[PDB]
Amino acid sequence: GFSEIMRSTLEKDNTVGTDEALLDIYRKLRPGEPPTKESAQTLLENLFF
Amino acid sequence: DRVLRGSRLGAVSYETDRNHDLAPRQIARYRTDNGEEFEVPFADDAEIPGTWLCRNGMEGTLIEGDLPEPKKVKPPRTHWDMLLERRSIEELEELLKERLELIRSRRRG
Amino acid sequence: LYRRVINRNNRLKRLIDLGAPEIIVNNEKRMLQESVDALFDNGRRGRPV
Amino acid sequence: GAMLDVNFFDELRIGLATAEDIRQWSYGEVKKPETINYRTLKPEKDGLFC
Amino acid sequence: AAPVTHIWYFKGVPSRLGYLLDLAPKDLEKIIYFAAYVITSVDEEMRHNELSTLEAEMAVERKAVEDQRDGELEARAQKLEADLAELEAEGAKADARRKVRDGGEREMRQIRDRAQRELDRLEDIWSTFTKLAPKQLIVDENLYRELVDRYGEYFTGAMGAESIQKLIENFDIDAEAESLRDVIRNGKGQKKLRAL
Amino acid sequence: EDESEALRQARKDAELTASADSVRAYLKQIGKVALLNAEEEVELAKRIEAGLYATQLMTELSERGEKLPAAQRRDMMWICRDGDRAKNHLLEANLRLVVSLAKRYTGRGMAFLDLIQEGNLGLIRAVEKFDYTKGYKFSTYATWWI
Numbered sequence: 252g253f254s255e256i257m258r259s260t261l262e263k264d265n266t267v268g269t270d271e272a273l274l275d276i277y278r279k280l281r282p283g284e285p286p287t288k289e290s291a292q293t294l295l296e297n298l299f300f
Numbered sequence: 301d302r303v304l305r306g307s308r309l310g311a312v313s314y315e316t317d318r319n320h321d322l323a324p325r326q327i328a329r330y331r332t333d334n335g336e337e338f339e340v341p342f343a344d345d346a347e348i349p350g351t352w353l354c355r356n357g358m359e360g361t362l363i364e365g366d367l368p369e370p371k372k373v374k375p376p377r378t379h380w381d382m383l384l385e386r387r388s389i390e391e392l393e394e395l396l397k398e399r400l401e402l403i404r405s406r407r408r409g
Numbered sequence: 410l411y412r413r414v415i416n417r418n419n420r421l422k423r424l425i426d427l428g429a430p431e432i433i434v435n436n437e438k439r440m441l442q443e444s445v446d447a448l449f450d451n452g453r454r455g456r457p458v
Numbered sequence: 459g460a461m462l463d464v465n466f467f468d469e470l471r472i473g474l475a476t477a478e479d480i481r482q483w484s485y486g487e488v489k490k491p492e493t494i495n496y497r498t499l500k501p502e503k504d505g506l507f508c
Numbered sequence: 509a510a511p512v513t514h515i516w517y518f519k520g521v522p523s524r525l526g527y528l529l530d531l532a533p534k535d536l537e538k539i540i541y542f543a544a545y546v547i548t549s550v551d552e553e554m555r556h557n558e559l560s561t562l563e564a565e566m567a568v569e570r571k572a573v574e575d576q577r578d579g580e581l582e583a584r585a586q587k588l589e590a591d592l593a594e595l596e597a598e599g600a601k602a603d604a605r606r607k608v609r610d611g612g613e614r615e616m617r618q619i620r621d622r623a624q625r626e627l628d629r630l631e632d633i634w635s636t637f638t639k640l641a642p643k644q645l646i647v648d649e650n651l652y653r654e655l656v657d658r659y660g661e662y663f664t665g666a667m668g669a670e671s672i673q674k675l676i677e678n679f680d681i682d683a684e685a686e687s688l689r690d691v692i693r694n695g696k697g698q699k700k701l702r703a704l
Numbered sequence: 705e706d707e708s709e710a711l712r713q714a715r716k717d718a719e720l721t722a723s724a725d726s727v728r729a730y731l732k733q734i735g736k737v738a739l740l741n742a743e744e745e746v747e748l749a750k751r752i753e754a755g756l757y758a759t760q761l762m763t764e765l766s767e768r769g770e771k772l773p774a775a776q777r778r779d780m781m782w783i784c785r786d787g788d789r790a791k792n793h794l795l796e797a798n799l800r801l802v803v804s805l806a807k808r809y810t811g812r813g814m815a816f817l818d819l820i821q822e823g824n825l826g827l828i829r830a831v832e833k834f835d836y837t838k839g840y841k842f843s844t845y846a847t848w849w850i
Contacts, residue, residue: 271710278714283721283728286711309499357487379832383756386835392757396783399754403779411506413818415491420821422509430792432799433824435542436730438510438668440817442541443726446515454519454537455724534722543722543729618707647720649736 328352330360337363410448410458417441511669513540529675530684535645542667545652547644548674550663558662559638566634570627577623584616633658643675727817734799742841748790749836755787794831794842795824801843802827805850826850 252258266272270288277284277291284290325341330352332338338354350368354360361367383392421437447458460467475483492505501507517524518540523533531539538544591612595605633651637659646652646665656665666674691703705711723729740748758780765772772780802823810816830849834842 270705274711274714278718282718283723283732284718285715286718288705288711309494309501353486355484355486356481357489380756380760382832383753387753392753395750395754396757396761399750399758399783400779403783407779412491412493415488415506416818417821418509419489419491420825424825425509427825427828428788429824429828430795432733432796433821433828435667436733436817436824437821439542439726439729440821441510442512442669445512446519449515450519453515455726537722537724541726541729 329363330354331363332356332358332360334358336360410444410451413458414441414444414448417444511673513669513672525672529643529672529679531643538645538647539667540669540672544645544647545665545667546671546675547640547642547646547663547665548671549678550640550642551661555640555662558659562637562659563634566630570630573623573627573630577620580619580623581616584612584619587615588612637662642678730817730820731803734796734803737793737796739800740794740797745794745842746836748794749834751787751790752794752831753787755784755790758787759784791831795827798827798831798842798846799824801846802850805847823850 266275270292273288273291273295274286277286277294280294323343325343326346326348328340328342328348330338330340332354334356336354336356336358338352338356338360340352340354342348348362350366351359351361351370417437417440421434421441424434424437443454446454451458486504486508488504488506488508490502490504490506490508492502493507494500494505495502513525518526518533518536523536525531526533526536529536535544539546588609591608594600595608629651633654636646636651636655640663646655652665664674665671688703692700695703719732723732762780762784803820806816806819806823809819826849827846830846831842833849834845836842838845
């Protein structure tokens, strides 16, 4: 709430919906693969945790 | 461990490059299939073969029309041969008739 | 590199002699193309051999 | 020009070589990947050292 | 047993093949590794004659397609009248009697969307066949297959190094030379820099 | 959401990729056609053997033989072409098993795509010598040749 730059990137994200961001992450990182939401869902869990 | 002494598989014998007299040699003018002529210097007492593998990579025959007729080997094996070595004549005829009736049922029903 | 190019070219010539589907022939020709690329400059286009 | 290159040159014309130039250069079409026979240690027929 | 492009005249910057054919290097790598086809040649006379006859043919095809689509509309209307007979003739709920109608409308929407998507694909392939020209890339294999088996005349299209050899075969250096001389004579800006 | 058009649109953008990994390009290529079952393989072997005998008999009648009717000539020519179309269908169907076998033979001498390609040539040999009347699945017989 205090963070100004985080607030400006909060309003400036142009993507709402968690899986709508998940496919964005998968499309930027993967490209050459279908969305298949659960495969994008596990990947961010797989890549860091 | 070793002293790193290399040697290619070759022999070096130093004689004088003499050019005054040599062995007398004929010349065979081989010709390929695609109108290409090549020359091989063969000796006098030398059986000249009718065909020869020239620099073009194709089997160049001798341009003198001797034509020794090698009568080459059979074609190795075809898929027809692989079919025929396990099936029967009336079996293939029956399958032909089945698929012919199938094209009847396809086109005209 | 010369052995790779000779191998893939002879296999491609065998494949066209055999009569092969389009996917196998195109994959073989792409392999031959990448082999000649590796011969003239390895490590230029993508992964070095 | 030269083929054994006795020392009298003036120019070294580089040039983009065509397929006719390459198959006119060569002395034979190598068509086998066999380098050296495994036992007799001599170069093979139509191999890379033929 | 099949031609090959030299990597020096393709991958070095600037790509000399890319300048000689005025292709982008992304397009060049997409061609010469068999990732996308290229229309190496095209016809004109057969193109415009059968453009007339085939615009009539694709209009016939779209008419039969719309006949299939409103036949699907008739089938959905009959199933919706079945939903009427099963929702407002016996004892049914207030909103479950209309959720079946909303599901039938959903089915009609996705059915007409399917017919609309193949309609747009047929329209796209007709637009592509009208705007066909040499040195054009065609990505999306299925579109190239449909274009080939529909209009296998009027053009040739190969893929890879043999297509590149065909392209340099059908290329006058003098025509492109005088074209670029005229462009560096008259033009300006980024077109002048690229033309130089 | 399956029918979310951003998802299938991103799929349509993701198939439009460069993919300089040529192995990944070939795998994306072979992932297109779907896999068969036993009745499919039986029908394909039927078409292959029928078209083989059809082009054999057409070769026989091509030498000095019967002047064929245009109709019988047309249907047997369609049979001949459909046999090889089914054959290419079979090979392109079973490319994936070849990749499954050659994924374990890697790492010693040959590279990966050379292994996949020679497995494909063995697959061609297997579907040449494959019999369907023995009542076994095709992958069982093809595994030996691959």
